[PDB]
């Protein structure tokens, strides 16, 4: 069965005293005016439960909680037993063992952080077949930190079951320290307004409460329809790698590139991605990828990285300080080393200067070490510009050959022929969608364009340097990106002292783009009481064709008042008409007078304050 | 002739176009787009980049608010003087010299 829990489930949020204050608590509570289940059975324990039972002869004993129906709480004739054990439970009527309709019982059950909390309250009632109307708070009873997981529960034995949901409440702590009232902050616009001004009374006026944003209905990915995988194996499972001073640069293009193949390959002793997190490459897109391959000892592999210094960094192969890509190195001792010491791998050691990044040098002129010109004299004072390697597998592991590849790519905002494995979806337009073009994540409304892009441009841009125009990676059509419609939410309220009715103002929207707790919020979303003004969509007021003095100012010459009772919307009137009977020979003269005393109030001073720098910022530290 | 009204409109135009144009600065991170950071890093360091953009945009918005608040006092003094002029010149004959 079902029923309506008007205002229940409020429990003291924590063991902290407050007085005459109106607090704001964000915690798991039971929303007011909620459809809750009525019983005279296995029931789930979502996150929290509001159990309220009316009985007179104690027809109920306790509860059973857990997932694999686990802890028992029961109340026999006099005492109560609390313990968690493996029991022989369809029940009918160890870690810890805490064995210690006129009457109404409300219980709140929560297990957060593994701590089990019980809140309780009793009250006399002379009522039948209905939840009593009133406000009451549930004090804590006992905290048991069993540290077990629970998914469902069932009582021991009419009653009601309510579930707690994440909500924020405005609670009212009296001088005696007891919550005599509360506000469900999400129930209706009026409650939200009472939240913004932390009081249960709201004077007449207009109040801005929240921001309203249309939400992405769906998600759209548009990627190139190319199919051939990037020949990563040809780069890695190749025949042999060139000597470092002549590092091969092999480009990768026009291919879908799965990088999970490199991740799952567990023969890589160093996989550190620099410009991007490795686990996101499969969804990005790239302009072009360069694979630079060469062989270096493990000690000198550290030279191959952005913004470092070393002989190979300066004389042979330099990665710039703003490198974009991933660096892959692995052992190839079995396939890149001779028995007597291989010297096929060579490196440049006698150069006249350093190298700018990505610069290859094949210079073949004798290096000078003395002060005399070399003139092709090899030996003293003139060295050969290169140096050799010694490759025997009998040395320390730091000296073994390491085939090292730098998967350099430009992640520029460019045509991006290369992409990852991502499944393109059909293109839907004119709707607020969470699109994804070539990795340009974002949300908005896409429409046809009257623009013309240059045959190499990939997307437009706004003055804010934000994307507002794109070309479809599959159909080459210009699309218009407009951010999803939005605005502020204002509540048009006659004072709470006067009425609980409210009207809602949506700022800068068209009354069709507005579509929320439905039993309260949705009433202020449709009907024949929706009005569109120059300040946005006004919902909850009647557009009368009269005109009166401005009572609550909406905007653009529109004011709204509470009249008959309901709320009206009118174009304000400046004042009463008149026509002074002017004539060339007609004057008017007073025959009496009046002495009228009026008042002007003018602020003169304000409280004098003085805040200490150290005491406020650091205090006693 | 209408220099003052146009100046007010223009000072509103800039210092607001400046605020919009300030939404595209690195402030020390890899990119000026949050999503570009989001779609390129794990949260443990995309957090650092987003934090740097947050600090930059917070300084920018606070500075803009302060300038607007100061300009508001100037416009308010002008409007109070205009109301005084309306009451004393329009609703009467003034004996104040050059007012």
């Amino acid at each position: 069965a079902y029923t309506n829990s008007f205002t229940r489930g409020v429990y003291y949020p924590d063991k902290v005293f407050r007085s005459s204050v109106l607090h704001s608590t964000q915690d798991l509570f039971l929303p007011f005016f909620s459809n809750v289940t009525w019983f005279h059975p296995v029931l789930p324990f979502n996150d929290g439960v509001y159990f309220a039972s009316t009985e007179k002869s104690n027809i109920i004993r306790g509860w059973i909680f857990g997932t694999t129906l686990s802890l028992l709480i029961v109340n026999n004739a006099t005492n109560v037993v609390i313990k968690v054990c493996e029991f022989q439970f369809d029940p009918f009527l160890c870690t810890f063992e805490y064995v210690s309709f006129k009457n109404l019982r409300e219980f709140v059950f929560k297990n957060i952080d593994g701590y089990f909390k019980i809140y309780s309250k009793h009250t006399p009632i002379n009522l039948v077949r209905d939840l009593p109307q009133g406000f009451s708070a549930l004090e804590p009873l006992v905290d048991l930190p069993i540290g077990i997981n629970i998914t469902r529960f069932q009582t021991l034995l009419a009653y009601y079951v309510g579930y707690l949901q994440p909500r924020t409440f405005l609670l009212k702590y009296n001088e005696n320290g007891t919550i005599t009232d509360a506000v469900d902050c999400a129930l209706d616009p009026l409650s939200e307004t009472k939240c913004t001004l932390k009081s249960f009374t709201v004077e007449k006026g207009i109040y801005q409460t929240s921001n309203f944003r249309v939400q992405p209905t769906e998600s759209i990915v548009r990627f190139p329809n190319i199919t051939n995988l990037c020949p990563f194996g040809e780069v890695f499972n190749a025949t042999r790698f060139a000597s470092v001073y002549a590092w091969n640069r092999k480009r990768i293009s026009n291919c879908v590139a799965d990088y999970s193949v490199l991740y799952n390959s567990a023969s890589f002793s160093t996989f550190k991605c620099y410009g991007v997190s490795p686990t996101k490459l499969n969804d990005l897109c790239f302009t072009n990828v360069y694979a630079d391959s060469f062989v270096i000892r493990g000690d000198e592999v550290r030279q191959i990285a952005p913004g470092q210094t070393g002989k190979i960094a300066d004389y042979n192969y330099k990665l710039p300080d703003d490198f974009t890509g991933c660096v892959i190195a692995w052992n190839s001792n079995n396939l890149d080393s001779k028995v007597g010491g291989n010297y096929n791998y060579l490196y440049r050691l006698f150069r006249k200067s350093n190298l700018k990044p990505f610069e290859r040098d094949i210079s073949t002129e004798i290096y000078q070490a003395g002060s005399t010109p070399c003139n092709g004299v090899e030996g003293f004072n003139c060295y050969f510009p290169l140096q050799s390697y010694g490759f025997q597998p009998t040395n320390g592991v730091g000296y073994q050959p390491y085939r090292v590849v730098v998967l350099s790519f430009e992640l520029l905002h460019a045509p991006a022929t290369v992409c990852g494995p991502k499944k393109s979806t059909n293109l839907v337009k004119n709707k607020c969608v969470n699109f994804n073009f070539n990795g340009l994540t974002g949300t908005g409304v896409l429409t046809e364009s009257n623009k013309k892009f240059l045959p190499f441009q990939q997307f437009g841009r706004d003055i804010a340097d934000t994307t507002d125009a794109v070309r479809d990676p599959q159909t080459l059509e210009i699309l218009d990106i407009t951010p999803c419609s939005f605005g502020g939410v204002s509540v048009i309220t006659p004072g709470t002292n006067t009425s609980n009715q409210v009207a809602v103002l949506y700022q800068d929207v068209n009354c069709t783009e507005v579509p929320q707790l439905t039993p309260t919020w949705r009433v202020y979303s449709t009907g024949s009481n929706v009005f569109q003004t120059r300040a946005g969509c006004l919902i909850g007021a009647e557009h009368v064709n009269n005109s009166y003095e401005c009572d609550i100012p909406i905007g653009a010459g529109i004011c709204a008042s509470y009249q008959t009772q309901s709320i009206i919307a009118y174009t304000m009137s400046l004042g009463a008409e008149n026509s002074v009977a002017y004539s060339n020979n007609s004057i008017a003269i007073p025959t009496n007078f009046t002495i009228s005393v009026t008042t002007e109030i003018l602020p003169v001073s304000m409280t004098k304050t003085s805040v200490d720098c150290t005491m406020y910022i650091c205090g006693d530290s | 002739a209408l220099g003052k009204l146009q100046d007010v409109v223009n000072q509103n135009a800039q210092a607001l176009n400046t605020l919009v144009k300030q939404l595209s600065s690195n402030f020390g991170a890899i990119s000026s787009v949050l999503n570009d950071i989001l779609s390129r890093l794990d949260p443990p360091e995309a957090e650092v980049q987003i934090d740097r953009l947050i600090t930059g945009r917070l300084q920018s918005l606070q500075t803009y608010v302060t300038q607007q608040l100061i300009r508001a006092a100037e416009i308010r003094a002008s409007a109070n003087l205009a109301a005084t002029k309306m009451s004393e010149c329009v609703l009467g004959q003034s004996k104040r010299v050059d007012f």
Partner: nanobody
Amino acid sequence: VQLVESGGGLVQAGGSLRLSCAASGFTFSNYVMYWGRQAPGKGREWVSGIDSDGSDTAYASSVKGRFTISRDNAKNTLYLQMNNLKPEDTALYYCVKSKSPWTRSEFDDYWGQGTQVTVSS
């Protein structure tokens, strides 16, 4: 920093073993530890990775779907539970400190004591 690994032994097909190592000289909650094995006389390999929190786990393609990785931050212990074990897995296994925190890149600046793991029938 100090590392001593525990576990390992003669294991037959379908068997299990538990490896653990502590980290001192730093709290170890921030850093990420990988599992590395070198077959004798061959190259070192990356077996599996764990996120700094413990939520994200990655494995080599070789051990995907067969091995269980788990670590406990509070007593600083990293564990590896291995299923469908075989003579193919024979290697010296290393738990390494990745020198860095709150990042997912996989490589190690340091190498632990290692364990001698002999797999035979």
